Amino acid sequence: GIGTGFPFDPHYVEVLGERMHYVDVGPRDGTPVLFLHGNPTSSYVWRNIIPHVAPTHRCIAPDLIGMGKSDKPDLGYFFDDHVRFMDAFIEALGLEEVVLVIHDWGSALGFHWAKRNPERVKGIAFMEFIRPIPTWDEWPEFARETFQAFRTTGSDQLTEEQIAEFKEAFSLFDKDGDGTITTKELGTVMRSLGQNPTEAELQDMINEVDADGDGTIDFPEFLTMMARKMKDTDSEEEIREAFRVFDKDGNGYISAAELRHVMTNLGEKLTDEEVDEMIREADIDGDGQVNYEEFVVMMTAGDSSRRKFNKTGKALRAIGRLSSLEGGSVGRKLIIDQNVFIEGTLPMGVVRPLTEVEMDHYREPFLNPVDREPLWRFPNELPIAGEPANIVALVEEYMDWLHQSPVPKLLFWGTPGVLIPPAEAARLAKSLPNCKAVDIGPGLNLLQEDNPDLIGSEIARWLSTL
Ligand SMILES: [Ca+2]
Ligand SMILES: [Ca+2]
Ligand SMILES: [Ca+2]
Ligand SMILES: [Ca+2]
Ligand SMILES: [Ca+2]
Ligand SMILES: [Ca+2]
Ligand SMILES: [Cl-]
C-alpha cells in the first residue's frame, strides 16, 4: 500500500521577479538535503522518500519555475532558464553546504551546480539522471518513436527549392528583414488582403507556432507549419480560400485586375503587361480568365512569372493555414493541447499502475494548456544525437566533473529503466568514485513510484557516512 498523501507545509520565495515554492521540514541545523525533481513531475515525486530522511536531516524540495506550485512566467523555459532560477533560489535561502538528491532534469541542475560550486557539495544521490547519448539507437526503442515526435517538428524532408519557395513566401511578410514576423506586420498583410482580424486573433495564430518563445514567428517555425499533410478534402478549404482572395466579386473567375491587385498589394513587380504571360499558363479554355479548376492547377504544379505566382500562393496559403490554429508543431500539440506527456508518457514511466488519486496531483500544475511550456521544452533539450549542441557540451562537462569528483555518490537503478539501463548502471558503479549502486528491481523512469521504500532506505544509511 504505497501512500499518496502530500502532508508537507508549503513555503514560498521570490526569485528573479517570480515566486517559487519549496518544502522545508527537518532539523534547522546541519547540512540541508536539496531534492530536485524533473520532467514531468514536481515535489510530489519525493512524497514517500522525505519521511525516511526528514527526522535526521533537513529536507528541501522545490518545484522548478513554471512547475509544481512555483510561478508560471511567460518564458521558453529552456534549461538555462531553470539554471538562472535555481541559482538565485539556492542563494536566496543562504545555503552553503548542500547534499543533493536529484532525478531526471533535476540531476542536470544539481550536477551543473555542483561543477560550479564543488566546495559546497557534501553528497549526491541520484537516479535516472541526464546523460549524453550518441545515437538514437541507444535511446530505448519503446519510446524512440514517441520522443522523436516531440523533436521531429519541421524540416520534414523539405529540399531543393521547396525551402527556397517558402523563403520567398517568408519575404512577403518581413519588410524590415528581422527574420521574425511581427504580430502587427502579419496584420499589415491581413488588412492588405481584404481582411482585418482582431488583435486577439492576430496573436492567437502566432501563439500556435512560436516554439522559440520570441512571441513572434520564425522561419524554422514557418517551415513546421507548412507540412506536407495534404488531405484530399481537408486541404481543399485553404486552396478554395486562396481562390476567394483573388475572386473579389465572387463570380467564379480571377480577373487580370483581380490577379494583379493582391500581388501588387504586397511586394511584387507587375506592370500592365507583366501579368499576361502567366495568364497563358493558367487560361487553358481561352476565356481570358482563371476559374477554380484552372487555379488548383497552378497551385499544384521556366519560372518567368511562375516564380512570382507560386511565391504568393505559398504566402496566401500560409494565411489560411495560420488561421486554422492547427499549423503548430506536431510535438507541441501532443504535449500542450492533447497533453500526452501527463496522459501517456508519465504513466509509461512507472511499471506499476499509478492510481487516479496519484496522477491527479500531477495534473494539478498543468490544468491550463498554456502553462505546459516546460513540459515540451524539456524533451527538446535532451542531449540526443549531439543536439542541442549547447546542452550536449554542458552535460558532457559535469559528467567529466563527476568522473573525478571524490564526493560520495549514491546511484539507484532499475530494470529495464529508460535513461539508465542496467548495462550502463553497471559501468557507473565500477567507474565513478565513491559510487555505490542500489538495484530496485522493476523500474523505468520514476523509480520513486515503484519502490519508494527502498529509495529512502539506502539513502538513510548512506546519510550517516558523513
Ligand atoms: Ca518583419
Ligand atoms: Ca520566435
Ligand atoms: Ca529568433
Ligand atoms: Ca472575378
Ligand atoms: Ca480560363
Ligand atoms: Ca492549438
Ligand atoms: Cl524529458
Side-chain angles (χ1 to χ4, degrees):
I2 297 301
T4 177
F6 205 63
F8 301 105
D9 293 356
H11 304 268
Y12 301 88
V13 55
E14 172 269 330
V15 162
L16 293 171
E18 311 295 332
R19 294 151 291 180
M20 293 176 59
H21 158 262
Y22 65 98
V23 178
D24 199 2
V25 184
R28 301 295 88 178
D29 201 5
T31 300
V33 178
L34 191 70
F35 283 80
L36 299 183
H37 73 87
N39 203 41
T41 83
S42 59
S43 296
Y44 191 77
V45 82
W46 312 109
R47 67 192 182 281
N48 307 126
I49 313 164
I50 297 174
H52 298 63
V53 178
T56 71
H57 292 65
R58 174 179 175 178
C59 302
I60 308 178
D63 294 329
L64 309 185
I65 184 67
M67 303 172 68
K69 296 188 181 183
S70 300
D71 284 9
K72 292 152 175 49
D74 193 7
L75 300 175
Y77 293 97
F78 287 85
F79 177 73
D80 185 59
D81 293 325
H82 293 276
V83 173
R84 294 184 295 102
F85 275 85
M86 188 57 60
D87 282 358
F89 159 78
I90 291 176
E91 285 288 67
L93 274 61
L95 296 187
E96 289 294 324
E97 50 265 33
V98 167
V99 177
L100 292 176
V101 184
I102 49 193
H103 163 247
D104 192 79
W105 276 106
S107 63
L109 288 174
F111 279 143
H112 179 60
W113 190 90
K115 186 199 66 177
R116 297 170 299 165
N117 296 272
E119 74 287 345
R120 295 171 49 177
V121 174
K122 308 298 181 178
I124 299 176
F126 56 100
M127 66 230 66
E128 281 282 296
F129 61 96
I130 294 299
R131 57 159 301 195
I133 62 110
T135 71
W136 274 107
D137 292 299
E138 300 241 327
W139 184 271
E141 47 182 335
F142 88 103
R144 187 175 304 168
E145 187 182 15
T146 71
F147 274 76
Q148 275 180 340
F150 303 152
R151 309 155 50 105
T152 45
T153 71
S155 174
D156 201 16
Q157 218 165 11
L158 311 188
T159 49
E160 52 256 5
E161 291 240 38
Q162 287 189 355
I163 51 174
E165 287 184 62
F166 293 124
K167 78 180 182 184
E168 283 281 48
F170 207 67
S171 301
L172 268 307
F173 302 90
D174 288 331
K175 299 163 55 61
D176 64 318
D178 43 353
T180 60
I181 306 188
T182 314
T183 187
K184 286 180 53 185
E185 208 143 18
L186 168 64
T188 308
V189 313
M190 296 281 286
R191 291 174 283 266
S192 194
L193 266 53
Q195 306 176 354
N196 202 339
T198 76
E199 258 293 331
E201 295 170 338
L202 260 176
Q203 62 195 33
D204 212 5
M205 300 178 300
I206 299 191
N207 292 333
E208 176 72 6
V209 62
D210 174 48
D212 191 301
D214 274 315
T216 77
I217 292 178
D218 298 1
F219 180 74
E221 299 173 346
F222 196 87
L223 295 179
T224 181
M225 171 183 56
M226 315 295 289
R228 55 175 59 184
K229 306 301 186 302
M230 317 173 187
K231 308 185 222 62
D232 291 305
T233 311
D234 198 13
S235 68
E236 193 168 352
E237 201 67 52
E238 34 181 290
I239 164 67
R240 283 198 175 272
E241 256 296 317
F243 187 89
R244 312 276 167 77
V245 180
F246 294 92
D247 198 16
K248 285 302 178 61
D249 55 9
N251 66 339
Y253 304 92
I254 299 178
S255 306
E258 290 177 330
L259 190 78
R260 88 158 82 100
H261 201 355
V262 286
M263 295 188 312
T264 53
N265 252 29
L266 309 184
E268 287 285 44
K269 175 189 174 183
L270 284 315
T271 80
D272 299 333
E273 302 286 58
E274 298 304 319
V275 309
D276 305 3
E277 50 271 33
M278 44 181 158
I279 298 291
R280 305 294 178 272
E281 300 211 8
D283 183 18
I284 53 190
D285 56 12
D287 61 356
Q289 289 178 311
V290 184
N291 57 42
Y292 172 77
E293 309 200 36
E294 294 175 353
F295 186 64
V296 308
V297 167
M298 271 189 158
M299 301 281 287
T300 57
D303 50 321
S304 174
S305 297
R306 188 206 208 187
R307 166 206 66 261
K308 292 280 193 173
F309 182 85
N310 292 7
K311 182 187 194 181
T312 66
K314 291 290 170 182
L316 271 64
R317 190 189 298 99
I319 294 298
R321 204 181 293 260
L322 277 167
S323 303
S324 62
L325 281 312
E326 249 62 39
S329 123
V330 49
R332 285 185 58 86
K333 301 307 112 184
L334 307 194
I335 301 181
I336 298 301
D337 286 334
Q338 297 164 169
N339 205 26
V340 311
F341 216 84
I342 298 296
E343 218 65 41
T345 295
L346 171 56
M348 284 176 54
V350 191
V351 68
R352 77 160 180 84
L354 291 169
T355 71
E356 273 289 341
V357 62
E358 274 174 338
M359 279 187 56
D360 217 336
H361 271 96
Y362 285 140
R363 314 172 182 277
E364 181 170 322
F366 313 103
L367 300 167
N368 270 333
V370 65
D371 298 333
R372 302 161 185 169
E373 193 73 19
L375 261 41
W376 176 85
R377 177 53 60 181
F378 269 138
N380 283 272
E381 292 275 50
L382 285 171
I384 289 179
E387 209 183 43
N390 63 317
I391 307 298
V392 167
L394 193 152
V395 300
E396 215 154 356
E397 281 191 19
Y398 69 64
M399 289 281 90
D400 286 351
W401 169 90
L402 194 68
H403 291 313
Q404 59 88 65
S405 188
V407 296
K409 305 171 191 54
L410 175 56
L411 171 57
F412 294 101
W413 63 283
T415 53
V418 175
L419 301 175
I420 302 300
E424 187 70 28
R427 322 174 202 177
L428 300 166
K430 301 176 101 67
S431 305
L432 299 174
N434 297 86
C435 181
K436 51 160 301 179
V438 178
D439 189 2
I440 74 169
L444 287 160
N445 178 258
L446 286 84
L447 307 186
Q448 310 87 345
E449 301 290 349
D450 272 328
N451 304 120
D453 200 321
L454 180 58
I455 298 303
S457 300
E458 292 289 346
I459 286 179
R461 299 284 166 167
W462 180 80
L463 285 153
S464 300
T465 55
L466 279 181

Coordinates of all heavy atoms in Angstrom, one line a residue, residues 43-107:
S43 N 7.5 18.3 -6.6 CA 7.9 17.7 -5.3 C 7.0 16.5 -5.0 O 7.4 15.8 -4.1 CB 7.7 18.8 -4.3 OG 8.6 19.9 -4.5
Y44 N 5.9 16.3 -5.7 CA 5.1 15.1 -5.4 C 5.8 13.8 -5.6 O 5.4 12.7 -5.0 CB 3.8 15.1 -6.2 CG 2.8 14.2 -5.9 CD1 1.9 14.4 -4.8 CD2 2.6 13.0 -6.6 CE1 1.0 13.5 -4.4 CE2 1.6 12.1 -6.2 CZ 0.8 12.3 -5.1 OH -0.2 11.4 -4.8
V45 N 6.9 13.8 -6.4 CA 7.7 12.5 -6.6 C 8.5 12.2 -5.4 O 9.1 11.0 -5.4 CB 8.5 12.7 -7.9 CG1 9.8 13.4 -7.6 CG2 8.8 11.3 -8.5
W46 N 8.7 13.1 -4.5 CA 9.5 12.8 -3.3 C 8.7 12.6 -2.0 O 9.2 12.7 -0.9 CB 10.5 13.9 -3.1 CG 11.3 14.3 -4.3 CD1 11.2 15.5 -5.0 CD2 12.4 13.5 -4.9 NE1 12.1 15.5 -6.0 CE2 12.8 14.3 -6.0 CE3 12.9 12.3 -4.7 CZ2 13.8 13.8 -6.9 CZ3 13.9 11.8 -5.5 CH2 14.4 12.6 -6.6
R47 N 7.4 12.4 -2.2 CA 6.5 12.5 -1.0 C 6.7 11.3 -0.1 O 6.5 11.4 1.1 CB 5.0 12.5 -1.5 CG 4.6 11.2 -2.2 CD 3.3 11.3 -2.9 NE 2.8 10.1 -3.5 CZ 3.3 9.6 -4.7 NH1 4.2 10.3 -5.3 NH2 2.9 8.5 -5.1
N48 N 7.2 10.1 -0.6 CA 7.4 8.9 0.2 C 8.9 8.6 0.5 O 9.2 7.5 0.8 CB 6.7 7.8 -0.4 CG 5.2 8.0 -0.7 OD1 4.8 7.9 -1.9 ND2 4.5 8.5 0.3
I49 N 9.7 9.6 0.2 CA 11.2 9.4 0.4 C 11.7 10.4 1.5 O 12.6 10.1 2.2 CB 11.9 9.6 -0.9 CG1 11.2 8.8 -2.0 CG2 13.4 9.2 -0.7 CD1 11.7 9.2 -3.4
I50 N 11.0 11.6 1.5 CA 11.3 12.6 2.6 C 11.1 12.0 4.0 O 12.0 12.3 4.9 CB 10.6 13.9 2.3 CG1 11.0 14.5 1.0 CG2 10.8 14.9 3.5 CD1 10.2 15.7 0.6
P51 N 10.0 11.3 4.3 CA 9.9 10.7 5.6 C 11.0 9.9 6.1 O 11.3 9.8 7.3 CB 8.6 9.9 5.6 CG 7.8 10.6 4.5 CD 8.8 11.1 3.5
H52 N 11.8 9.2 5.2 CA 12.9 8.4 5.5 C 14.1 9.3 5.9 O 15.1 8.7 6.4 CB 13.3 7.5 4.4 CG 12.2 6.5 4.1 ND1 10.9 6.8 3.6 CD2 12.2 5.1 4.1 CE1 10.2 5.8 3.4 NE2 10.9 4.7 3.7
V53 N 14.1 10.6 5.6 CA 15.3 11.4 5.7 C 15.0 12.6 6.7 O 15.9 13.1 7.4 CB 15.7 11.9 4.3 CG1 16.9 12.9 4.5 CG2 16.1 10.8 3.4
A54 N 13.7 13.0 6.7 CA 13.3 14.2 7.5 C 13.7 14.2 8.9 O 14.1 15.2 9.4 CB 11.8 14.4 7.3
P55 N 13.6 13.1 9.7 CA 14.0 13.1 11.1 C 15.4 13.5 11.4 O 15.6 14.4 12.2 CB 13.7 11.7 11.6 CG 12.6 11.2 10.7 CD 13.0 11.8 9.3
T56 N 16.4 12.9 10.7 CA 17.8 13.2 11.0 C 18.3 14.4 10.3 O 19.0 15.2 10.8 CB 18.6 12.0 10.6 OG1 18.7 11.9 9.2 CG2 18.0 10.7 11.2
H57 N 17.9 14.6 9.0 CA 18.5 15.7 8.2 C 17.3 16.6 7.7 O 16.2 16.1 7.5 CB 19.3 15.1 7.0 CG 20.5 14.5 7.4 ND1 20.6 13.3 8.1 CD2 21.8 14.8 7.1 CE1 21.8 12.9 8.3 NE2 22.6 13.8 7.7
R58 N 17.7 17.8 7.4 CA 16.7 18.8 6.8 C 16.5 18.5 5.3 O 17.5 18.1 4.6 CB 17.3 20.2 7.0 CG 16.4 21.3 6.3 CD 17.0 22.7 6.5 NE 16.4 23.7 5.8 CZ 16.7 25.0 5.8 NH1 17.6 25.4 6.6 NH2 16.0 25.9 5.1
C59 N 15.3 18.5 4.9 CA 14.9 18.2 3.5 C 14.3 19.4 2.9 O 13.3 20.0 3.4 CB 13.9 17.0 3.5 SG 14.5 15.5 4.3
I60 N 14.8 19.8 1.7 CA 14.3 20.9 0.9 C 14.0 20.4 -0.5 O 14.9 19.9 -1.1 CB 15.3 22.1 0.9 CG1 15.8 22.5 2.3 CG2 14.7 23.3 0.1 CD1 16.8 23.6 2.3
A61 N 12.8 20.6 -0.9 CA 12.3 20.0 -2.2 C 11.5 21.1 -2.9 O 10.3 21.2 -2.8 CB 11.5 18.8 -2.1
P62 N 12.2 22.0 -3.7 CA 11.5 23.0 -4.5 C 10.9 22.4 -5.8 O 11.3 21.4 -6.3 CB 12.6 24.0 -4.8 CG 13.8 23.2 -4.9 CD 13.7 22.1 -3.8
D63 N 9.9 23.2 -6.3 CA 9.3 23.0 -7.6 C 10.0 23.9 -8.6 O 10.1 25.1 -8.3 CB 7.8 23.1 -7.6 CG 7.1 22.1 -6.8 OD1 7.6 21.0 -6.7 OD2 6.0 22.4 -6.2
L64 N 10.4 23.4 -9.8 CA 11.0 24.2 -10.8 C 10.1 25.3 -11.2 O 8.9 25.3 -11.1 CB 11.5 23.4 -11.9 CG 12.3 22.1 -11.6 CD1 12.8 21.4 -12.9 CD2 13.5 22.4 -10.7
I65 N 10.7 26.4 -11.8 CA 9.9 27.5 -12.3 C 9.0 27.1 -13.4 O 9.3 26.3 -14.3 CB 10.9 28.6 -12.8 CG1 10.1 29.9 -13.1 CG2 11.8 28.2 -13.9 CD1 9.4 30.5 -12.0
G66 N 7.7 27.5 -13.3 CA 6.7 27.0 -14.2 C 6.2 25.7 -13.9 O 5.4 25.1 -14.8
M67 N 6.5 25.0 -12.8 CA 6.1 23.7 -12.4 C 5.7 23.6 -11.0 O 6.1 24.5 -10.2 CB 7.2 22.6 -12.8 CG 7.6 22.6 -14.2 SD 9.0 21.6 -14.5 CE 8.3 19.9 -14.3
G68 N 5.0 22.6 -10.6 CA 4.5 22.4 -9.2 C 3.6 23.6 -8.7 O 2.5 23.8 -9.2
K69 N 4.2 24.3 -7.8 CA 3.5 25.5 -7.2 C 4.2 26.8 -7.4 O 3.8 27.8 -6.9 CB 3.1 25.3 -5.8 CG 2.2 24.1 -5.4 CD 1.8 24.2 -4.0 CE 0.8 23.0 -3.7 NZ 0.4 23.1 -2.2
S70 N 5.4 26.7 -8.2 CA 6.1 28.0 -8.5 C 5.3 28.8 -9.5 O 4.4 28.3 -10.1 CB 7.5 27.6 -9.0 OG 8.2 26.9 -8.1
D71 N 5.7 30.1 -9.6 CA 5.0 30.9 -10.5 C 5.3 30.5 -12.0 O 6.2 29.7 -12.2 CB 5.5 32.4 -10.4 CG 4.9 33.1 -9.2 OD1 4.2 32.4 -8.4 OD2 5.1 34.3 -9.0
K72 N 4.4 30.9 -12.9 CA 4.5 30.5 -14.3 C 4.6 31.7 -15.2 O 3.7 32.2 -15.8 CB 3.2 29.7 -14.7 CG 3.1 28.3 -14.0 CD 1.7 27.9 -13.8 CE 1.6 26.5 -13.2 NZ 2.5 26.4 -12.0
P73 N 5.8 32.3 -15.3 CA 6.1 33.4 -16.2 C 6.1 33.0 -17.6 O 6.2 31.8 -17.9 CB 7.4 33.9 -15.7 CG 8.1 32.7 -15.2 CD 7.1 31.9 -14.5
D74 N 5.9 34.0 -18.5 CA 5.8 33.7 -19.9 C 7.3 33.6 -20.4 O 7.9 34.6 -20.8 CB 5.1 34.8 -20.7 CG 4.8 34.4 -22.1 OD1 5.0 33.3 -22.5 OD2 4.2 35.3 -22.8
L75 N 7.8 32.4 -20.4 CA 9.2 32.1 -20.8 C 9.2 30.9 -21.7 O 8.2 30.2 -21.9 CB 10.1 31.8 -19.6 CG 10.3 33.0 -18.6 CD1 11.1 32.5 -17.4 CD2 10.9 34.2 -19.2
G76 N 10.3 30.7 -22.4 CA 10.6 29.5 -23.1 C 10.9 28.3 -22.3 O 10.8 27.1 -22.7
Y77 N 11.3 28.5 -21.0 CA 11.6 27.5 -20.0 C 12.8 26.6 -20.5 O 12.7 25.4 -20.3 CB 10.4 26.7 -19.7 CG 9.4 27.5 -18.9 CD1 8.3 28.1 -19.5 CD2 9.5 27.7 -17.5 CE1 7.4 28.8 -18.9 CE2 8.6 28.4 -16.8 CZ 7.5 29.0 -17.5 OH 6.6 29.7 -16.8
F78 N 13.8 27.2 -21.2 CA 14.9 26.4 -21.6 C 15.7 26.0 -20.3 O 15.4 26.4 -19.2 CB 15.9 27.3 -22.4 CG 15.4 27.5 -23.8 CD1 14.5 28.5 -24.1 CD2 15.8 26.7 -24.9 CE1 14.0 28.7 -25.4 CE2 15.4 26.9 -26.2 CZ 14.5 27.9 -26.4
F79 N 16.7 25.1 -20.5 CA 17.5 24.7 -19.4 C 18.2 25.8 -18.7 O 18.3 25.8 -17.5 CB 18.5 23.6 -19.9 CG 19.4 23.1 -18.8 CD1 19.0 22.3 -17.8 CD2 20.7 23.5 -18.8 CE1 19.8 21.9 -16.8 CE2 21.6 23.1 -17.8 CZ 21.1 22.2 -16.8
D80 N 18.7 26.8 -19.5 CA 19.3 28.0 -18.9 C 18.4 28.8 -18.1 O 18.8 29.5 -17.1 CB 20.0 28.8 -20.0 CG 20.8 30.0 -19.4 OD1 21.7 29.7 -18.7 OD2 20.5 31.1 -19.8
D81 N 17.1 28.8 -18.4 CA 16.1 29.4 -17.6 C 16.0 28.8 -16.2 O 15.9 29.5 -15.2 CB 14.7 29.4 -18.3 CG 14.7 30.3 -19.5 OD1 15.4 31.3 -19.5 OD2 14.0 29.9 -20.5
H82 N 16.0 27.5 -16.2 CA 15.9 26.8 -14.9 C 17.2 27.0 -14.1 O 17.2 27.0 -12.9 CB 15.7 25.3 -15.1 CG 14.3 25.0 -15.6 ND1 13.2 24.9 -14.8 CD2 13.9 24.8 -16.9 CE1 12.1 24.6 -15.6 NE2 12.5 24.5 -16.8
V83 N 18.4 27.1 -14.8 CA 19.6 27.3 -14.1 C 19.6 28.7 -13.4 O 20.0 28.8 -12.2 CB 20.8 27.2 -15.1 CG1 22.1 27.6 -14.4 CG2 20.9 25.8 -15.6
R84 N 19.2 29.7 -14.1 CA 19.1 31.1 -13.5 C 18.2 31.1 -12.3 O 18.5 31.8 -11.3 CB 18.7 32.1 -14.6 CG 19.7 32.3 -15.7 CD 19.2 33.4 -16.6 NE 18.0 33.1 -17.3 CZ 16.8 33.6 -17.0 NH1 16.6 34.4 -16.0 NH2 15.7 33.2 -17.7
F85 N 17.1 30.5 -12.4 CA 16.1 30.5 -11.3 C 16.6 29.6 -10.1 O 16.4 30.0 -8.9 CB 14.7 30.1 -11.7 CG 13.9 31.2 -12.3 CD1 14.1 31.5 -13.7 CD2 13.0 31.9 -11.6 CE1 13.3 32.6 -14.2 CE2 12.3 32.9 -12.1 CZ 12.4 33.3 -13.4
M86 N 17.2 28.5 -10.4 CA 17.7 27.6 -9.3 C 18.9 28.2 -8.7 O 19.1 28.0 -7.5 CB 17.9 26.2 -9.9 CG 18.3 25.2 -8.8 SD 17.0 25.0 -7.5 CE 15.6 24.5 -8.5
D87 N 19.7 28.9 -9.4 CA 20.9 29.6 -8.8 C 20.5 30.6 -7.8 O 21.0 30.6 -6.7 CB 21.8 30.2 -9.9 CG 22.6 29.2 -10.7 OD1 22.6 28.0 -10.3 OD2 23.3 29.6 -11.6
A88 N 19.6 31.5 -8.2 CA 19.1 32.6 -7.3 C 18.2 32.0 -6.2 O 18.1 32.7 -5.1 CB 18.4 33.6 -8.1
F89 N 17.6 30.9 -6.4 CA 16.8 30.3 -5.3 C 17.7 29.7 -4.2 O 17.4 29.8 -3.0 CB 15.9 29.2 -5.9 CG 15.4 28.2 -4.8 CD1 14.4 28.6 -3.9 CD2 16.0 26.9 -4.8 CE1 14.0 27.7 -3.0 CE2 15.5 26.0 -3.8 CZ 14.5 26.4 -2.9
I90 N 18.8 29.0 -4.6 CA 19.7 28.4 -3.7 C 20.4 29.5 -2.8 O 20.5 29.4 -1.6 CB 20.8 27.5 -4.4 CG1 20.1 26.3 -5.0 CG2 21.9 27.2 -3.5 CD1 21.1 25.4 -5.8
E91 N 20.8 30.6 -3.5 CA 21.4 31.7 -2.7 C 20.4 32.6 -2.0 O 20.7 33.3 -1.1 CB 22.2 32.6 -3.7 CG 23.6 32.0 -4.1 CD 24.6 31.9 -3.0 OE1 24.4 31.2 -2.0 OE2 25.6 32.7 -3.1
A92 N 19.1 32.5 -2.4 CA 18.1 33.3 -1.6 C 17.9 32.7 -0.3 O 17.7 33.4 0.7 CB 16.8 33.3 -2.4
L93 N 18.0 31.4 -0.1 CA 17.9 30.7 1.2 C 19.2 30.7 1.9 O 19.3 30.2 3.0 CB 17.4 29.2 1.0 CG 15.9 29.0 0.9 CD1 15.2 29.7 -0.2 CD2 15.6 27.5 0.9
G94 N 20.2 31.3 1.3 CA 21.5 31.4 2.0 C 22.2 30.1 2.3 O 22.9 30.0 3.3
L95 N 22.0 29.1 1.4 CA 22.6 27.8 1.7 C 24.1 27.8 1.3 O 24.5 28.5 0.4 CB 21.9 26.7 0.8 CG 20.4 26.5 1.2 CD1 19.8 25.3 0.5 CD2 20.2 26.3 2.7
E96 N 24.8 27.0 2.0 CA 26.3 26.8 1.7 C 26.6 25.3 1.5 O 26.6 24.8 0.3 CB 27.1 27.3 2.9 CG 27.1 28.8 3.0 CD 27.8 29.5 1.8 OE1 28.8 28.9 1.2 OE2 27.3 30.6 1.3
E97 N 26.7 24.5 2.6 CA 26.9 23.1 2.4 C 25.6 22.5 2.0 O 24.5 22.7 2.6 CB 27.4 22.5 3.7 CG 26.7 22.9 5.0 CD 27.3 24.1 5.7 OE1 27.9 24.9 5.0 OE2 27.3 24.1 6.9
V98 N 25.6 21.6 1.0 CA 24.4 21.0 0.4 C 24.6 19.6 0.1 O 25.7 19.2 -0.4 CB 23.9 21.8 -0.8 CG1 22.9 21.1 -1.6 CG2 23.4 23.2 -0.4
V99 N 23.6 18.7 0.4 CA 23.5 17.4 -0.1 C 22.4 17.3 -1.2 O 21.4 17.9 -1.0 CB 23.3 16.4 1.0 CG1 23.1 15.0 0.4 CG2 24.4 16.4 2.0
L100 N 22.7 16.7 -2.3 CA 21.9 16.7 -3.5 C 21.2 15.3 -3.7 O 21.9 14.3 -3.7 CB 22.6 17.1 -4.7 CG 23.1 18.5 -4.8 CD1 24.0 18.7 -6.1 CD2 22.0 19.5 -4.8
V101 N 19.9 15.3 -3.7 CA 19.1 14.1 -4.2 C 18.4 14.5 -5.4 O 17.4 15.3 -5.3 CB 18.2 13.6 -3.1 CG1 17.5 12.3 -3.6 CG2 19.0 13.3 -1.8
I102 N 18.8 14.0 -6.6 CA 18.3 14.6 -7.9 C 17.8 13.5 -8.8 O 18.2 12.3 -8.6 CB 19.4 15.4 -8.5 CG1 20.7 14.6 -8.5 CG2 19.6 16.7 -7.8 CD1 22.0 15.4 -8.9
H103 N 17.0 13.8 -9.7 CA 16.4 12.8 -10.7 C 16.0 13.6 -11.9 O 15.5 14.7 -11.9 CB 15.3 12.1 -10.0 CG 14.4 11.4 -11.0 ND1 13.1 11.8 -11.2 CD2 14.6 10.3 -11.8 CE1 12.5 11.0 -12.2 NE2 13.5 10.1 -12.5
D104 N 16.2 12.9 -13.1 CA 15.7 13.4 -14.4 C 16.3 14.7 -14.7 O 17.6 14.8 -14.6 CB 14.2 13.3 -14.4 CG 13.6 13.5 -15.8 OD1 13.6 12.5 -16.5 OD2 13.2 14.7 -16.1
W105 N 15.6 15.7 -15.0 CA 16.2 17.0 -15.3 C 16.7 17.7 -14.0 O 17.5 18.7 -14.1 CB 15.2 17.9 -16.0 CG 15.2 17.7 -17.5 CD1 14.2 17.0 -18.2 CD2 16.2 18.1 -18.4 NE1 14.5 17.0 -19.5 CE2 15.7 17.6 -19.7 CE3 17.4 18.7 -18.3 CZ2 16.5 17.8 -20.8 CZ3 18.1 18.9 -19.5 CH2 17.7 18.5 -20.7
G106 N 16.2 17.3 -12.8 CA 16.8 17.9 -11.6 C 18.2 17.5 -11.4 O 19.0 18.2 -10.8
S107 N 18.7 16.3 -12.0 CA 20.1 15.9 -11.9 C 20.9 16.8 -12.8 O 22.1 17.1 -12.4 CB 20.2 14.5 -12.4 OG 19.8 14.3 -13.7

